[PDB]
Amino acid sequence: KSFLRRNALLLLTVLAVILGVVLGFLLRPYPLSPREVKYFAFPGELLMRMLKMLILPLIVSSLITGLASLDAKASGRLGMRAVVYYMSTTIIAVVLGIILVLIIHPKEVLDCFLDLARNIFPSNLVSAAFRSYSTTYGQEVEGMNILGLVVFSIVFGIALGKMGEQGQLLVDFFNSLNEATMKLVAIIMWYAPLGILFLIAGKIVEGMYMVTVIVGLVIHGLIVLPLIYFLITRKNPFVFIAGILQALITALGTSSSSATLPITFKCLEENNGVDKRITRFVLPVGATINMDGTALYEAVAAIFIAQVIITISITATAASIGAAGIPQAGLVTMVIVLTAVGLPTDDITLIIAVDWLLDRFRTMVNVLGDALGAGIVEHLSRKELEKQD
Amino acid sequence: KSFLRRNALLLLTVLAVILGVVLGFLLRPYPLSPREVKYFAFPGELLMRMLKMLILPLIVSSLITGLASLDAKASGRLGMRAVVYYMSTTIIAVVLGIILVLIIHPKEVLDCFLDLARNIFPSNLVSAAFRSYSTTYGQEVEGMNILGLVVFSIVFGIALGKMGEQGQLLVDFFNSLNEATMKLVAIIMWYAPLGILFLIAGKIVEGMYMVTVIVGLVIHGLIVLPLIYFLITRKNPFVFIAGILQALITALGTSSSSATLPITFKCLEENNGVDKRITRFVLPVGATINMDGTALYEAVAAIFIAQVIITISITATAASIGAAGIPQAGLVTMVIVLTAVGLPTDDITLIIAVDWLLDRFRTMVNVLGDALGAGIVEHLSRKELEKQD
Amino acid sequence: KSFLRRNALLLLTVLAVILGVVLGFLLRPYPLSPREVKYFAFPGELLMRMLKMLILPLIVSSLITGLASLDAKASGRLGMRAVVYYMSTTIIAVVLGIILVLIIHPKEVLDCFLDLARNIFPSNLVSAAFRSYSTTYGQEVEGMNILGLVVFSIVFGIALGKMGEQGQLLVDFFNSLNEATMKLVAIIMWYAPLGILFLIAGKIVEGMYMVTVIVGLVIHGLIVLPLIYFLITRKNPFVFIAGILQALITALGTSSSSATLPITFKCLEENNGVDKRITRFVLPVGATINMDGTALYEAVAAIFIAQVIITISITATAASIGAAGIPQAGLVTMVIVLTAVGLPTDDITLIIAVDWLLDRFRTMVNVLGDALGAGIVEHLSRKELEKQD
Ligand SMILES: COc1ccc([C@@H]2C(C#N)=C(N)OC3=C2C(=O)C[C@@H](c2cccc4ccccc24)C3)cc1
Ligand SMILES: COc1ccc([C@@H]2C(C#N)=C(N)OC3=C2C(=O)C[C@@H](c2cccc4ccccc24)C3)cc1
Ligand SMILES: COc1ccc([C@@H]2C(C#N)=C(N)OC3=C2C(=O)C[C@@H](c2cccc4ccccc24)C3)cc1
Ligand SMILES: [Ba+2]
Ligand SMILES: [Ba+2]
Ligand SMILES: [Ba+2]
Ligand SMILES: [Ba+2]
């Protein structure tokens, strides 16, 4: 009884996964048009817009204060410590993908590197809050420029840090804004179980590589990542993963690390006891530039098509970073990557009917990586963080 | 002479209605293209963009401070007291509409209830400041999401209230912003007479049901509403209506309660002597969810078409709430409501050439309802308001 | 050696003009498609979006504080003193253009005056941050409404000034914001040489009137304008022009006074020693309503076409003010001005292949005029500025 009292919200999302599959299998025969499916998955659709709402005011207020609270010279130190984690875990994942196809084996290319550089520096900061640049044959398309806003907020935040007295007001303005948006997420946590159960039920009611990706994704998230945690922190990872259980189950239903960022934040500040100044530093960047989960799913999909190496690995990386939160992101990223090799897009019509579940697993590995990444950073922060205290 | 000195701006808008009809009748024969009509009604067109400008920064700053100044638990009490007024006056109006067709008698349906729930929770708060969602066969169309911004500002404002110390800065930021935008409306008041005279003159230069609606709209605004004021407040209503005379004449020319909201605000705070904390609480919501005036005009138009009950009443309600400030709002709302019954849209081509005057009358009944509603709330506020003082 | 140490950034942009023409002439034979030209001028293209980014938060924060710091009654005095400079230098330029075609001689019209009045009062302030109104046969087109934002910020800033105590917080908020965005421009200064050298190199790799315009533009910028400086200030102008050398060379590569505004600001506050309160007052307005450079190039192009007076002068003025920062601004402004006279648009296909260099020269005369204009204002400010101190 005592476990049910405390982990009330946690077990409810566990129950939402069970009852979501149950209701999905209860209404599996579909005599109704996919239009009626959209009207059924509506209580879960509402949950998405509530989270999407809160992304932009959180992701902006988090980085602006996070880099201003931290010393401008020590932030560069901690930054390199965080980048080391990002580049390493990405290298291991792309290496893991090659081994995963060695034993088992079941818009232009240059523009995907030009539009990424173009998105990093936003031409208009308001247009950045809802539009992303992508060269098509206007040029600015729908979906938040989360990369350009993260980049700007990192330099704008650091500029306030180098201002001190005058800059203090703006930092006090964004910290009250970060707390205000985090006080709104307190209610979105309770709508999540009702949402997720109607969200996954509508997504089930609509190929050995499908199992191949899950094999790699679990071996990375349960061996590679926890072993990288135990190596530096010297602390038990399944104690750290236990705290972020509410965030990982939401990622299992959201399929967006950027939309689960508000939950992950409360799953690290409140549950695992991580300093706000370093969750605001690691997590927003990890929700936009992490490749651990996506590159391990994209690259394996880029070798399966060759049946029907250095160049393929770099193109799969700039795919997800070039699509932070764009419409039909997974669909377009796999289309552009096939032009780089030359293989036909006939195989893509098959992956769409199965990506709906695999995109949830890759986000779950990404969310785990951002959380564990923040945890690994904390141990290398202890010298710079005590300096401010 | 002494009356002309004080009520200078008031009598000038009275003179604008007279001179506007006079100039309209002076230039009634139209050998000029409707393109030339648009160039003539330009000094009135400019007035609209000046008001439209100020809607968003007022409607956001009003609710955020209004709900933060008030106690988070007492706001829920006052809210229920306000909702009681909204639901009651709407029920009387829809009942009045049935009696008005008993004696005299001269995009999908489900989507109008899905898009309303979708608009309440905005997917992006910046996209909310200029776009509204509406499923069409992109999906987000032009016109402010005033409902989603009102909803967000009510929960964001209440979150600041539950913050106290940290939240104080943001509330001080929006209250200085509410005063700044209200200091800009001081000048827009003087442009209104020159505007309205060229606005109504261009709108006259371009069916017993036309008189039927005015019969119901005046009997509601002069009997139903003032009697609801005298019943609770026990104060003379035509003394309260006298103060809001500058706001009612602007509504007679604007045809938007949301665009007359900046005038109505100064017509209650300065003219009728109503506490800012409860004008900021009632009026913005009344300008977005009031049905007293619109449902009494929409429902009567929904029975006139049947010649050439419970289901018709609920659909006419979600029409205006689903079109807070959308392009050709009255045109699209009557198109979707005819699909729910089945009657042809042939009759709609006739109502457009006469709605231009009837939309001004419905807004006038709405504006009166929001003002009287705020007045009725004040008497039920006296216990909760003295608590803060 | 000592000159190279101090003027490090200055001589690097001088070197960028040299090496930019050199690299442009090194890669002048073009066997590559204009698509490949766009991929080559990319390190200069990135510089533009970095500046464009910073326009809106600078142009808004500059005017709001600038007019609030200054007395609301004295700002009207200084304003008339600034307007006098704008109207005079524009009259001399349009007169100079008539003399320049006397000795050498080598969407509707009304809508360009209706859309300008429509843009001055923005219908939505968020839509103003990225869209400008222009009647076409939706109605709001891409490109910032810099005029509507300048107009609003001037009245919003003055409203804060007339608020005092309550208004102080918002002014402290925008001044910390002006300093934050100006601390970001410190880095964009160093990217400028690498940018400009790849920006002009890509623009060279793609008619006596071409030389005629440069004759007028230099005689105005080296005689008319410096003589207007020496007449009032009684100080050497080529000492004042020397300080703004980093800003004039950026205008020679940017072709936008609005995008060089962040550099010009640091080129007057730091280099020439001009009071922030009057640079924030003159420069943003000068970057949006100046005609000295553009009207002297547009009007000369409006007489050259007549080969293949009062009405032509007023239409060329409302062209640039109607296109503050719109896509293909110089292309559309010359198209609409030919309809006013009646001459064919066949000559316009020839000016496009040469405007790329002439648009850089007109912006340079505009930037010089805004800087010298601010300098001339300072001497007429000394009484009103010492009053605040
Ligand atoms: C391309 O996507 C990115 C941008 C940033 C980061 C790192 C990060 C994380 N995680 C955060 N929170 O801050 C900084 C980072 C640095 O590497 C460097 C650090 C920094 C310090 C001082 C000056 C800087 C100037 C520009 C950019 C970063 C700067 C801040 C990683 C990837
Ligand atoms: C659908 O459109 C609406 C939204 C709000 C309202 C009411 C209102 C008015 N008028 C204002 N100013 O505040 C609140 C209202 C409540 O009913 C409840 C009240 C409230 C108190 C505490 C927590 C809340 C949480 C969510 C929403 C309202 C809350 C605030 C009416 C219709
Ligand atoms: C059409 O484009 C413009 C708008 C403004 C200006 C002038 C200017 C410059 N430069 C600045 N910084 O402030 C003011 C100006 C005034 O003429 C008048 C002055 C002013 C003082 C008091 C009340 C005002 C009310 C409305 C507008 C300006 C006002 C401010 C020039 C052209
Ligand atoms: Ba990584
Ligand atoms: Ba400090
Ligand atoms: Ba009502
Ligand atoms: Ba308090």
Ligand SMILES: [Ba+2]
């Ligand atoms: Ba001028």
Ligand SMILES: [Ba+2]
């Ligand atoms: Ba003061």
